[PDB]
Amino acid sequence: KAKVKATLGEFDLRDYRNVEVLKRFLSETGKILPRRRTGLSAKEQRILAKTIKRARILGLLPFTEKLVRK
Amino acid sequence: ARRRRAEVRQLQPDLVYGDVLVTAFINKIMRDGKKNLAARIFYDACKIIQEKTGQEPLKVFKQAVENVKPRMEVRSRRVGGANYQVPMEVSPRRQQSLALRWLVQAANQRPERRAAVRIAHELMDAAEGKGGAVKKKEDVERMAEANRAYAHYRW
């Protein structure tokens, strides 16, 4: 569909507290989205996943969700 | 029928009531190419419908057939190990053929000594819903549906 990167302005993707931003990079099942979807550079996507994994331990982001209407 | 889908052999309308479905029946009655004797029989039988009811023969026969048509049948089926009886819907053609096939086999199972009679009574009984044809049929519709677990092939 349309890339998640393209729907945002600047943002520090080292920022493991900005759950508002971070959360659009997760799927409806709280799974880290692949680059095909996130629209990221390899290097960026590496840094992302790292800080997504931080948010998660902080309690700020989900490790999982359940799929609604299936 | 590897290549094409086979032309449904299209049938001479009836000499008497002007209906295609009747020749079809007369044909299933017919042995060894003797369409004459076959046709006597079916007509003789239609006369026995008259004398034994105020009904017009044609619409007895029509409505008998309609009562012998199966809705579902069980065609056998390989599953890389076992052959299962698989329930599935029945082509309008096949409805019609199986009907007339069973009408005549049912007819010829009967006790009455003369063919025109057996044809006649079986027809009567069938429009009513209680010929030997209809048992050889609710038997089918039963067996399909009593195998309804395997309706998830259909092939």
Partner: protein
């Protein structure tokens, strides 16, 4: 027995059986069915038709507790699954939501030989 008007339908589709269990909205089970509880035994419990019948049976037993609607929750992939769902929907019983909640390791325990194959 108690009157609960809505609660959960928990479907457990597996390649060997669908088991449908119905609960109050806190998760305590009211009734339950399975391919075995219906007539079936052995390989036939797996069928989608088995699924329908269990879904329908367990939904009937649940309407005996005056159940009106359910949150559906599915787990496992299995022949009977969308069939078990389709049953509930068309059972009188009203289906508010449907939710896949199939449990999955964040790779953890070694599978049995049969389920390693992806090795």
């Amino acid at each position: 027995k108690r009157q609960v008007a809505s609660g959960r339908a928990y479907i457990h589709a597996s390649y060997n059986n669908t088991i449908v269990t119905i609960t109050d909205p806190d998760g305590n089970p009211i009734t339950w069915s399975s391919g075995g509880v219906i007539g079936y035994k052995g390989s036939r419990k797996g069928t989608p038709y088995a699924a329908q019948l269990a879904a329908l049976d367990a939904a009937k037993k649940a309407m005996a507790y005056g159940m009106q609607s359910v949150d559906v929750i599915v787990r496992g992939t299995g022949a009977g699954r969308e069939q078990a769902i389709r049953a509930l929907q068309a059972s009188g019983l009203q289906v508010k939501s449907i939710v896949d909640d199939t449990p999955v390791p964040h790779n953890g325990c070694r599978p049995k030989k049969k389920f390693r194959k992806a090795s």
